[model samples]
Target: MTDTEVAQITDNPYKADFPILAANPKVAYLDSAATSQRPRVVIEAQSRFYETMNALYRWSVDATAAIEDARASIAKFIGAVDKNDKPESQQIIFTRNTSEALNLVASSLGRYALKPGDDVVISIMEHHSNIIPWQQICKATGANLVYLRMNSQYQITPEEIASKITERAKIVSVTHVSNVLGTRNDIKAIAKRTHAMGAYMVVDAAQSAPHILVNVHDLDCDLLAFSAHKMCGPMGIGVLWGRAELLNAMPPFLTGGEMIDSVTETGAVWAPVPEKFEAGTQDAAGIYATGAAIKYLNGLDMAKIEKREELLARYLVQQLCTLDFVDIVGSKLGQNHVGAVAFNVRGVHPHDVSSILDMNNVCIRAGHHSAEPLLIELHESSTCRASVAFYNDKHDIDQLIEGLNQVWKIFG
Candidate 1:
């Protein structure tokens, strides 16, 4: 393709930044929903950790400062800014992953606030992490786990929200985007309706934060969780952003080490919100890498990222529709989706399709996507999911189609 044409089709000029994509030139990595490929700069940021790993307060101060800086960047990235619009790093808490972040909120808020006869609302589209925590919490607290079912369009309709979210609803947790369906949820509207009923809204942004322009305040959620690894950062770094009041009131998920203010024979004073949740020595390298990842995303401008991915996703769905043997698992319109698009080859098991795609060096995810409940609801045992990122182009989609043709020929 000509330079101008490629530029028009692929707006991501930073595609080369990912070392793995560069190494595997012919491979079409369409599995960003699972975990994004990290950029070289982000990797380099982690490399600095080893150099500096070799003072007590001085050493501690340096690490603390770095963590704070990373925290500030992350806070800004997710739009958790303060009064002057400066990043409110205090609102950002580092965790192991999005699962842990969600678990922390459940263990703290879900444990304390929920009571018998109350309801904790979630969508059928939730990941296993989102579903399991609430299930456990509801079982323990006698709070019923109410699921907001979706319509034919794979959406939680207005009526569904109106009906499912009753006065008994204590908490409403939902995903910003479905990792299984590529379906985007209306968090702003959901948050509004949830708060109207005096229920706190929790958003799982692990699926949307990377590809969508997210402003925590805009969504108006009480708490938000996302993983850095899903957004081109290293593994083991997750983020949890909660409103100050809620955070302060909630107890720490874990205790010990730097998470406390002082320890006495009988008791110990806990640290402030962020530190109270942190507890142990964090993954400094992972944190640094996440900071770099956010910086890189900021450079790209999330608005543009969203638009570009929307175009890619739309194109992906349109192209998938052309194959009669392929059945898309969710909303057919790409505009209503994000990166992940679930589908299946007619009469072919998802695993078999995925295995065949791997032969073409095109990576994709198959199975329940850690969301078995949703799969069961869709009447699908499992489905193959192809996801995209800014780095992917039409050529990658072409490769996927080509690979699918081969799979069809072998199995049709």
Candidate 2:
């Protein structure tokens, strides 16, 4: 569909579809970057799976087929399949969230390849989830962790990446978008450099996946990780998408009951592709719900969703920057960001600012937001962030602006 066709879906059409909104009318729910609100259809799909088909897939033959079918649909949504290998759906291994997804790769890959004196390159704008896993892996494997520097706007340029990617760089992992700064990086360029050096490129797409269309092939990333909850899906279910052969070649991260070819008294042959990675009972219901989320997003189209968010972002930033004590962070590159905004008041703690706004029946995120290094680099212990969704409106911005004025009057 065209961007305009997708733009039509941008308004609060799905807001009323959420039961949580009915329970809390005053809740602005601007923290969608943390976890989006699930639509009624999505909630029901998940709940119904448990209600109607609660049988364990291990025992029930019918349940096994149903679960696999759901996986196939998920694979189709991500464009992960071809005649060459199983679709991305087969490669999807559900984890608690993006953090676990990265760990799966880190634990397994580090076990196989990470070594002392090798370097892992990342950017300053990473969520701790992305940063720490690699850090731990590096420590465990005796590898060095290197961080790519960012400019004032928090953009990690190709030059910065090039400088940090030395001959010793074993793996290059970068966030597709800055969870704090909201600056989008050039994965294509980074991927090119990383591959040229014979190093694998791993993308932490927790932020980008929710707001943009991510095609693993298009990005040419060796492995990609993202969550479902950040995009109007249920919690406790996210996925790691990787090149099929690459995933097949890596040692399995977790091994247990469900992922076995044949378990004897002594050893077991691991199942192929995804089954090799999935260890125990999968979150079948949440995975089914994520399929619904992908359907909803596909219907709307990513380009259109991004365009609408950008339009709102330009207006929101222009007005937010006008507040005397308020400083908007990052590039503020209009729609160059997703539907999130981070700001700080000159003389107030972010928690205190959020508390004041909370008193007015409004909501926003306040703190390091899991990107402590990025925040500390910016010289703030924490920040006030207002993340938007398709359900947000101009009226929400008005409310935020009005609340900020009161906060500035009291704190400034």
Candidate 3:
């Protein structure tokens, strides 16, 4: 696959719409830190759902067919299928976003798992979405929240986790990929340690899932959550994949409608596992469109996509290193990193840098990147972030470099 010519790159199993080059023809979408562009396949799949599959599934046969198809599609993508599992769709829960998915686990399962004076562990790298829910849940349950710190390299070592993961820790939450630093963590190692301590491991894959291939079984985490929009699918929809037996045992996160097996005058019987968790009207179109995104990703081949992005990240970082008085935090070693990079231009605020880049049509994210604790540790308020997807190329990096060169005069 790596031997293929650049001309053959088109045949390399990718979609035109995903090629950010097409959308920005002039606008470099380095801000995938926010969200990714959807491919034609995803857009069309969602359109088809509305055009042909729209219906209420609570009791209607037509809506049942639509919801079933979506569940199976997503479950298959995430490797959540069981050999004899009926409805097969019960394995995946469609959530509003990753935040909702994590909250469902925290609120529903946490209610049962946590105790007063117990602890929940998370890292400085967590997004607010991953942080706040657990904080509230822990506080409500009288459990305290603990944060794991990173070493000077901006890397969280297993040793760091070892210290923070006391017997008091009931749950361990960490980001699979550092959004601002472009750091790829060893979730498997972390999971093993957390599990050994009798604590459950929950991964925030919003960053990792979009840029690389992910399998929950491989990570050995009890629960996993990700958003479709970050992975080139629709917004307002995400997924949470938890262990089947554990899901079945946990109380319902949301109650009402199709999720009910029986609603008697006294009490209601909830449907099996996932269906029990999916409350109210579903995002039928968003779910189906995410399935299309999986199809698009399958064509491009995740290994090749990751390889290209890795190359671009190394190249981009090398270029930025030449700039005077600039501090690029998160990663100093480019080897294990993805395409995401965060940096600061001395004497220029990140917002000002972003404004200058915007004037040049060079898109990037500037601010805490939803990682306030990490920002504080790095001894900065915020930094400008340039995160690349597979669609970004060497030219995009060069354009950013040119824009940076002009920043002094522009800001001055």
Writing each residue's lDDT as its tens digit, candidate 3 over 81-101 gives 666633345767889988899
For all candidates in order, the CA lDDT equals 0.89, 0.80, 0.81
Can you write out model 1's per-residue Cα lDDT over 159-222, one digit (the tens) per residue?
A: 9998988888999999999998888899998888898888999999999889888899889999
- Model 3 gets an lDDT of 0.81
lDDT of 2 by residue, 1-412 (tens): 3465335433555567688886776766678878888888888888887887766455366556666776776666666677775655677777889999998888887777777999888888888888888889998899999999888667777778788988888888999987777788899889998888778899998888877777777788988888889988889987888887788889988788888898988988999988888888888778778877777777877787776666666666767767868888776555556667899988898888899889877788998899998877888778989877767766667788888888888988
What is the C-alpha local distance difference test score of candidate 2?
0.80
lDDT of 2 at 96: 85
TM-score of each predicted structure versus truth: 0.96, 0.93, 0.92
Best by TM-score: 1
Each candidate: RMSD: 2.0, 3.1, 3.1
Better of 1 and 3 by TM-score: 1
In model 3, which range of ten residues has the least summed lDDT? 6-15
Off by over 4 Å in 1: 1-7, 10-12, 53-57
Candidate 2 has its poorest 10 consecutive residues by lDDT at 1-10
Candidate 3 residue pairs in clash (backbone atoms < 3 Å): 13-299, 13-300, 24-27
